[PDB]
Design a protein around this nucleic acid. Sequence first.
RNA 1: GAAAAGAACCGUGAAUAACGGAGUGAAAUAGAUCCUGAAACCAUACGCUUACAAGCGGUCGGAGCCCUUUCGUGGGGUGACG
RNA 2: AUGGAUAAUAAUCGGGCAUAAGCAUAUUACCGAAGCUAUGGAUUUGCAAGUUUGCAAGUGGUAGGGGAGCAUUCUAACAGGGUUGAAGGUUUUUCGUAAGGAGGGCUGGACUGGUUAGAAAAGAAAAUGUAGGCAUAAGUAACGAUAAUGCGGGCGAGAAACCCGCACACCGAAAAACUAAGGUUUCCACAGCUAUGCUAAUCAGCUGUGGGUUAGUCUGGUCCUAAGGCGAACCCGAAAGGGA
RNA 3: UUGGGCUGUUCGCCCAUUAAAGUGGUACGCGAGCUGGGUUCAGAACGUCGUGAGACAGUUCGGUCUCUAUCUACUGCGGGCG
Lengths: 128, 51, 113, 59, 125
Amino acid sequence: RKRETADARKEANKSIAFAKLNNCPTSPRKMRLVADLVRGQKVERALNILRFSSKEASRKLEKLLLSAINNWEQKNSEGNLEEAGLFVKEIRVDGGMMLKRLRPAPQGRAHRIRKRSNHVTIVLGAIN
Amino acid sequence: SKRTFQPSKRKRRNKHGFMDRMASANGRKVLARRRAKGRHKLTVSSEPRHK
Amino acid sequence: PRSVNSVAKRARRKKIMKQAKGFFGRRKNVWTVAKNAVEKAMSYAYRDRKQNKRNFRSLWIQRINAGARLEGMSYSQFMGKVKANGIELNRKVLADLAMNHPEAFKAILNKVK
Amino acid sequence: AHPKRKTSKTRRDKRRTHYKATVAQIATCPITGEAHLYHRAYWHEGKMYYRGQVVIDKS
Amino acid sequence: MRHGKKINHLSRQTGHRKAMLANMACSLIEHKRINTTVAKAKALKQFVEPLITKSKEDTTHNRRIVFAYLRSKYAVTDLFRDVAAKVGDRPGGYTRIIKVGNRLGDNADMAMIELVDFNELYNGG
RNA sequence: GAAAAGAACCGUGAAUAACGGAGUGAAAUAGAUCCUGAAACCAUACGCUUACAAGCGGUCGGAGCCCUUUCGUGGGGUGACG
RNA sequence: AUGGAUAAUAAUCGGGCAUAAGCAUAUUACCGAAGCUAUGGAUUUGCAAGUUUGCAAGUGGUAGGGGAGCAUUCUAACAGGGUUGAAGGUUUUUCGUAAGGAGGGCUGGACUGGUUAGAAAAGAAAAUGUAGGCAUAAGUAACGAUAAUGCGGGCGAGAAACCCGCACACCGAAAAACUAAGGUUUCCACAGCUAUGCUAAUCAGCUGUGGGUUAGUCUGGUCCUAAGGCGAACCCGAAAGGGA
RNA sequence: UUGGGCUGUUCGCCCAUUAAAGUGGUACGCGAGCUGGGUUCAGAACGUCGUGAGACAGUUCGGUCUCUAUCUACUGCGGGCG
């Protein structure tokens, strides 16, 4: 196949509004806890939940949603924002490249400690 | 407790120094072996002194 | 020359693992667990083929017995009077008649009785 | 003691069903419209509103 | 079993607890509103209510009694000079506690323990 | 990457963290963790089942429900029950 | 048929249960295996026709023995394919006794391979096998002396840990000051929170930039010598070398 | 269906009571429940055997008892659904 044709056909992101957060120094199992409370909610209920969540994994997740809202506003320039009624269509928390360090355990041995990362992706979608 | 390595930068040179390796006939073969292998660091005398 | 069977080494196990499709847990993707499960599945499939031929005959016999006990008879007496009459109809056809064509089954019964 | 069998991804997924988080009790004040935690005060703009009134005026 | 233990140790020794309760009262007296945790504020309330109650009569014995609790002349004089004059003839409850959210380091519930007679903007209802 | 032409500039964001655009290219899902990039492993969406039922988890029978169809005693998925 | 004691987690015709559905003899029908037969197909020896067919006897299998073959890498000849898309990866269809062959869609963007003959670094599921990557235990143990912290201001987007101030507490023949051994820039100022700090950090013995060590009298050499080392000459020992 | 003296003791004898001070099994129940007093670790000494190194169903003094509970089995407490 012609790669330029395949790329021009796959470049259909001119409509979907999404946001990504790569290389976040936080574990994925602890952000998947707060992603479940946001998945499917409205774009303002999700903001309130992330702002009042008692988790350190929400301080940097509440602004990824704002960046997604801004990307939606950029893509749909002709039109307001409150009439559309945005929500959170899909949100996925994946793994990332982890760092490996050593901790000296008793009796002359060493244990491994993996500082994990995670990737977050969010798409909004509209009700209209 | 007390460990096995108690450093001394004169007891080290009096035992592993260049002039201690070059004084013996069989200690002079260590230099030949290390130069043949290609060791960037020869006897402990290669460590830089305090300046 | 150096010969490495790298491509076919995995192309051979892909075909054996593609038939472990639907297995619970790691029996469908892990190689040394799928291979141990596909061979046992084929061993189970070799047999049960001799048992499918004797588990259906039991069902046919039960259905013939049920259809014959509706006319005040038993399977043993019915089969005796059928075999010693020159009929030669297998239990598959006899059960199909007893289930779908009760008129034909009772006609056979009245003819052999 | 030591585990004798590796915990399957089914047995460890049926166990992480009460490990979910808890959404906080969020309320809204019909004075300034800002959202806050129920039974808690909040800073809107240099002030602290609790129950329709103002507690601190740091503007 | 603690069926009647109406006292909070606050995870501190018998001396450290009293030292902290005497150190927070001086702060609450010199600044009429301080920001603490919820349990520490609820304990400071029960520790500081009888002191302000005794402060409503300036006698040489009550001054020494309040000094034995506060352990600072700067707080004793500031409790007997203007705090007592501004409390007036209140029946009780000279302090109020209002939660202001949670902290960040350890996620502890906070509170804004304040004096009632020094806040002229808030009433309650 | 053939050649740095290695992303000027704009927006969210405290941020020269990251991302979404805009330009380079034949390709940016070739963006410097950079040729193609599998398996283990970790997740999301959709279709079928599952809270009275005991064991190498499969095999032989078997409804029901979803897709496709040269139209079929054709194909694919899940499968109550034995 | 009846009486002749029984063992320790709850028991037994396998169970329901049966007065025949128990026992003894006789008869008939039926069920009952990968046994035998009926149908289709494949293969090994022996016998004939030829250049595969017909008949007969077979065709469980460990140690072990024999015969036909597949894939992989490369080479020699002839004949090819590919940027109008090669190898590789992912799905699907079909063919063969099997190892395997061929075709289609998607990614991929430069090599590949048919026939005959040849060679071998020629095939993994196990060796408490090796290297790399990733799970489980699990968000569990732990976060390293039970001397202790509280509040108010400052920078700051962000403060339980940073700076300032007021309180509290601990050591004090010490947890105070000098300094040897040793370390060899960790010292001081400004920017930074990426990695390092068992947490965050606006902080740092961390990162990057600019600085910092001044001797006639202090410690060593230029002065001396002990234990010990080297040692012309001399004495020994295959050599190297030993004694002195 | 008792408490003590002796012994590492099981056993056994004795003392004082009681209605009685049962016989046994459960890896001579139970050490991821406890102790290590005895026995089979390295030291030392006695009697005896062996020329000797050394040994004894002979005796005496001293001598490190590891593990964060996965599945099932128990004692308690909850959520979901019917």
